[PDB]
Design a protein around this ligand. Structure first.
Ligand SMILES: NC(=O)c1ccc[n+]([C@@H]2O[C@H](COP(=O)([O-])OP(=O)(O)OC[C@H]3O[C@@H](n4cnc5c(N)ncnc54)[C@H](O)[C@@H]3O)[C@@H](O)[C@H]2O)c1
Lengths: 497, 497, 497, 497
């Protein structure tokens, strides 16, 4: 009854997956911890099994990663970029089947599963050039006969903990950047996307082995909170990149700070869209729909609060309701499907509780609010009106497709309301007003790390640094000078007189 | 009795100091907390009194600073730079008497007291140009009809906690950079340099008020651990820059992380000089003497470990012994005095404690080791041979002029020994070997934030970022792109189609 | 009968000016060339005399500057910045009399003459910080054991030729940046502003002399076409910064290219303002007025073409005609005066010639067009309608207050009409359309070096690079990385293995 | 009789070459000009024929490229990078045969022909990442309610004239960077490498066609000085990149300056290696041989002057003699060979004449100096000792493998001797002395664009900017911010208040 044993799913074997797969890689494949089965969220069928990491697997892997660092750190950065280039090519050759696996194990629709692999490919190609660019300025010393140089060196071992909802590209951003910066990596992915983690690691392992490099440069220890906690407490993990819930990330941040390590935290969001009276409503409505219900509301940048000018509130809500009723629901790998299941049954339960709480706090469900009666974890995408902007349920991140809608009148109050929550990830305003747009970007505007105009809260590109502020944790991934978080700066003065 | 009442110290009134001074400034001067008297370490006599902040003083000050931020953040950065330029000129007009105060209340010699004020003046003049430069790239979006912009905005209120040993310039680095970046500032200095804090704040307050700006832009709340703990726990303090001991800084870092705030930590040092067999000994001997005995060994960057190759160990120790005997001792504020008192009677006792522990662990005092028979807190600068490099007292940071001396044979082991301590602030090698120098600067070299060649561990310049790694806390101040720590990055996409 | 011998002009002596002045400075003062008298354009009265450079004067000065370079280039950049900071302060002390001199000898109103000196002060204060910043990256080499470093060094002697209309700040921009970059300078100002050149040089020489530096670091050789032609052919002049007409600038550019020198060319402008139908007309009209009529239309950035959407063409022209009639005319130094004289008698003849050609080519003069019947070189600011956008006089840069007004219908045509002239200095559109503004900034938009929105074609700030494209010459001054034009880049690889 | 018609050279057909080839590409292939036959310099046998561009072909092509630009400049830069990425891949697929063609038609050995194609592949992969990074800063305005933005836009059409000795990578450098910067390209290669130019253009044309882009984005017009002069005078060519002789480059620069165009000049070199008394001779000897004899002494960066300290002069010369003797001669496309022919018969006359002038000048041929007695253009690599550094034949660039050896004693004189020639391309010292190295990199050191330490004058990597000073022309290609030469800067002020 395992999906991998059905001919309909024989393509899983093109990723080198079988019934039971080793979930530890450090040059060798292993796994002496508990064997986990992962399940397809569209039908609750089991796919295949992964042998997770014991404590002894973890300990051996960290040691092998740190020995491998001695070799890797001596490789010139541009030659490390060539390795990353070859990783991108190897992902390229498996983009369709790996994208299908993302749809199957995680449950986002196919164009997004494939899109996620493509973005990993693209960050690899970007990192190739960046590997010839990382560094600091040589500055003029104020003293005769002295040179003044800013040097950047790898931090060493970069632990990477990733979440279920982007099970390929978050790791990929961290991996590609950490690698060209001279670090080795230890990945612990979400347990419910273990096959995805294993499949990606197989692809990278083959590149490293073909180049006669130690496999531990990109190590894998599949596991749950125990492995993640060990990494947070582990002084040999020089940088811990964590993507997950604010609640867990706060504890990881504390554990890393207690040992004077470095952390990079990419936590929850409670992202607002604001539609002013002059907004192009044929941009607002489809943008709100996609930002709120894309990936069944399970992006960290998912729109969860919609503020509408009172003059257009009713019209936007009515047009949003009609658009919701037209959303094509089905298996995430099927053509024309735009909306798949929630990732787990626990997520369905949390969705139901939020909807209940929203009614108890005085909200009105104007669309959805129910669990769909069908196989898998499907819930109706939901719209709630009538709550105050400071309703407790609206200040909570519920990782489900629920959109809280609010009226406003003036710019100043609704900029404050965007900013009042604890999260600080993404934000967008819809307006044509030149002044309002620059005030939004300015010091009295949005306090988030992603600040958008006439486009949804999701959809960032790799060219810029990605991450948020306040309880979103402050880390940055991908573009701009985000690479500096993966290295250590030294200020070096050479007296040559 | 109080030195400020004696005729020979009448120059203190040029700084606006009186017998009892208000230690809270927020646009108004006050202080309803505990009155503290600061003492002169050269003669153990009381100088004058400061009324410190009560809890209600702190609360009112924070609220006034955040109201002032609404005005200050709307001033264009180049116009903020103009205020910082005038702060620089106002320090210029007081440099001699302010430096004399640093020498009097803190105990460092006059050229370093004046030097501290000069460096605050220089960072102000630097910040003026920087104020027309801070910002991020406009990047090419992958999507037509979209702009992609990296914006930087002030974080808000920047709390600044400083230490006794650099009572002017540390605050000055943080103040000048935070100011041009659009932040307001709240200062809590060391209680034993309270007069210095008040005198500096008097100079800044006049500039602000003369420019019709609210004085809370640069607030002062003199106090000890309780005010410092309130700042680290206060959600209204968006960035806390802390300079101090590792033990206190670790608790400050954890408190700030608990609330998802930002911290900038500049902690202790255990700085090493390494002298290879090919070193120029006429550079080594004076550099080691200045780095070890300067400020009576009370710099963060003070050299406390001296590694000498076997072949030259005895000669260097002998030349250092002869050099130590030549130091001219006296009152620190007198020109041409080169060695002053330790900061407190406690520090004298801890000097004796460390010397005793060094002898217990097998070391030999080859010079000094005793208190000097004179008024004040004067001790002999001390040299200790024969310890093992991992001797417990050597891995400790003792804020005293004690130089632990070790032998070595090969490069690889002595690089490791540099790196084996918990601190990671400054480091220097003395060598002519081209390959050895770049290896020292490389991924297998010094793990410190300051990596120097043929000059001492101390005396860095503002053009570079100043700070350390590991238990030194990771923060950076002053130069390079250190301004980015005082601001929040946003990645901004404008769909204009 | 010279103004400098009249009591009401005794303030000229505060600049060190006498009845006859030396116009060569190379550490010593002199001048054996022809004596020139400069005249106040407000009354055609002679001010005072300046002895210009002979050929021997030029030869001696170039040789002393190149000797001074050997000292100057050895001075660390931040120390060079400290000199420039002192130049800034010395200008501050003389801002009122120096600005009055700009008004007296050149003819612009007092607020702009003072404002020109303030801008030189500001670029000095900017340069101070820049002097701790110039340099290039240290890059990761692809080869193990290699360092790859981009170095920047001074070019040597920077010759600076400047125009009459900005007789202070153009020199100041070049001087402050060239100086911090380790170059020595040689200035040949416009002959009709010789007294301004002497007075600026007196202020700088006293600073150099007070710092015990060779005065030839900032040398002066007053003269006309012969000295400037000599600098353009002089292989000893490593970079020639030329600010002036396109016709002369083209011959300078060729002479420099002939000898494989470097040139920085800041040439003519034919700047357009475009006002779209949705523009705030309460911004358009006063912006158009100040852009076309400011400095009697003698700025390189003066608006000489005004494109107005046909829907609003009549109303905008009517309001502009009414605003031109409310302009206060008088002596440039007198209060509330906004419009002064043209610079020379020839410029008045140029103005009348251009008006007749405009009417010959089918234009209608709807305001002004005549000389003013009063002493000095006063002409009426002039508005001409009815020319086709491609009239020859409309593509010519007449340095007089003439505004050619055109209608338009669509964005693509008017953008083309902006770009169709041979100049490419400044441009401005007035609109609220978010898409239009960013198309105006993009690859199908303005082709000029200064591309403005909702402010006139003038008023640039020092933080950006200032220059033009096409026949404007391509040079850049002041901000961004313009300093690179004053230095030479080297790509340096150190094999340390 | 044509090599392409002999079955042994059938592999030429894998590049799409035939007996007679079209030398014009603009989306279609043609050529109405004179038909040239190119010859293999290893045997002087004809390879194949190319129909060059008539004047009318040139006009048609320019008009098509400028129409293609309106499409290309609208494509977002990252998507332009994706095209360049695919160009790199398509070159990858043909690296062996294309490298073999470079050996056959130009005459360098196989590893360098392959390596030249590999370098083009590498610059493409670099440009992919760069295409997401180009741009300028958003700066803080001094005026409230204003944004200040630096914009970069393509210049339009980039004309590229290249030389025979690097017939692939020089074009590649200019093409990859011009393309991501939004320009279209028109290429005129050296007549004697017409087949290489056609073969490269076939590879790129396929990629443009497969992506449904106009092929005129990468236009080709094969021709001689007539076509090159037309490009130099054509106002439709916004940037002319010229690599070639100093004599021709000087005329090109003047023609472009005449029309206020942009030029990027990469001209001749007279590169020196300086070996100091402390140098590692195990490094000096093979580095001198490689730098002097690589590509038969036909690189712009070829070492042509070798200064040796008196102490080690004879030993280094004697060691070079033995090294030169191990140099293996043969057909350069055979993987055995280390030394191929000169490019032309005229080149051999140059070799002979120079060897004769050197002998008449008082130098001794201690090795080589004669024509090899075999088919092709083979000359013995040559070492000349005894001349004085200012001898006329040593200051002229002869494009043949002649190495002039000179003695010296002091650092100051020999730095001067390095800088005394007209060319300013590459330079190298061999030494272990720390101060001498940084002095060499400083304002009193080497005046060249490339300044190397303990490596040859040749073999730069793509990470840095490539180019020289003085009569080398001042252009820069490939790395750092050289991309700015392919774009136009605008400083943009937006008043949104
Ligand atoms: N890295 C640097 O830039 C730098 C510079 C100077 C000094 N230092 C280090 O500073 C130390 C100087 O000794 P010190 O006694 O002044 O340090 P300290 O930790 O005792 O006190 C420094 C500051 O922290 C305050 N403070 C004390 N307890 C606090 C608490 N619980 N919560 C918040 N604030 C508290 C103090 O009142 C004081 O202002 C040395 O260890 C030195 O190496 C580092």
């Amino acid at each position: 009854t395992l999906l991998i044993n059905q001919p309909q799913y024989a393509w899983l074997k093109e990723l080198g997956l079988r019934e039971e797969n080793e979930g530890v890689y450090n040059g060798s494949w292993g796994g002496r911890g508990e064997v986990i089965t992962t399940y397809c969220p569209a039908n609750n069928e089991p796919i295949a099994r992964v042998r997770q990491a014991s404590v002894a697997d973890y300990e051996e892997t960290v040691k092998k990663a740190r020995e491998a660092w001695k070799i890797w750190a001596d490789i010139p950065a541009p030659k490390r970029g060539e390795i990353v280039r070859q990783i991108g090519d190897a992902l390229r050759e498996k983009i369709q089947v790996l994208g299908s696996l993302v749809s199957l194990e995680m449950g986002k629709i196919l164009v997004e599963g494939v899109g996620e692999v493509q973005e990993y490919v693209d960050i690899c190609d970007y990192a190739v050039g960046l590997s010839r660019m990382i560094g600091g300025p040589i500055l003029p010393s104020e003293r005769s006969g002295h040179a003044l140089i800013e040097q950047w060196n790898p931090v060493g071992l970069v632990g990477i903990i990733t979440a279920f909802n982007f099970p390929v590209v978050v790791y990929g951003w961290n991996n590609a950047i950490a690698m060209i910066c001279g670090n080795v990596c230890l990945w612990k992915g979400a347990p419910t996307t273990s096959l995805i983690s294993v499949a990606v690691t197989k692809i990278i392992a083959k590149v490293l082995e073909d180049n006669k490099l130690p496999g531990a440069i990109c190590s894998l220890t599949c596991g749950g909170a125990d492995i993640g906690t060990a990494m947070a407490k582990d002084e040999r993990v020089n940088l811990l990149s964590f993507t997950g819930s604010t609640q867990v990330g706060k504890q990881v941040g504390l554990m890393v700070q207690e040992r004077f390590g470095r952390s990079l935290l990419e936590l929850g969001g409670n992202n607002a869209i604001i539609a002013f009276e002059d907004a192009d409503l044929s941009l607002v409505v489809p943008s709100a729909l996609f930002a709120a219900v894309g990936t069944a509301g399970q992006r960290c940048t998912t729109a969860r609060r919609l503020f509408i000018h009172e003059s257009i509130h009713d019209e936007v809500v009515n047009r949003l309701k009609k658009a919701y009723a037209q959303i094509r629901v089905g298996n995430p790998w099927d053509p024309n499907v735009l909306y798949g299941p929630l990732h787990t049954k626990q997520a369905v339960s949390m969705f139901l509780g939020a909807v209940e709480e929203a009614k108890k706090e005085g909200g009105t469900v104007v669309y959805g609010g129910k669990v769909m009666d069908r196989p898998g974890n499907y819930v109706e995408p939901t719209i709630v009106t009538g709550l105050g902007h400071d309703a407790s349920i609206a200040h909570t991140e519920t990782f489900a497709p629920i959109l809280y809608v609010f009226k406003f009148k003036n710019e100043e109050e609704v900029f404050a309301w965007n900013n009042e929550v604890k999260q600080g990830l993404s934000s967008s305003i819809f307006t044509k007003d030149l002044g309002r747009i620059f005030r939004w970007l300015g010091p009295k505007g949005s306090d988030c790390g992603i600040v958008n105009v006439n486009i949804p809260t999701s959809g960032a590109e790799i060219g810029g640094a990605f991450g948020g502020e306040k309880h979103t944790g402050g880390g940055r991934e991908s573009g701009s000078d985000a690479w500096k978080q993966y290295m250590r700066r030294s200020t070096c003065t050479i007296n040559y007189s």
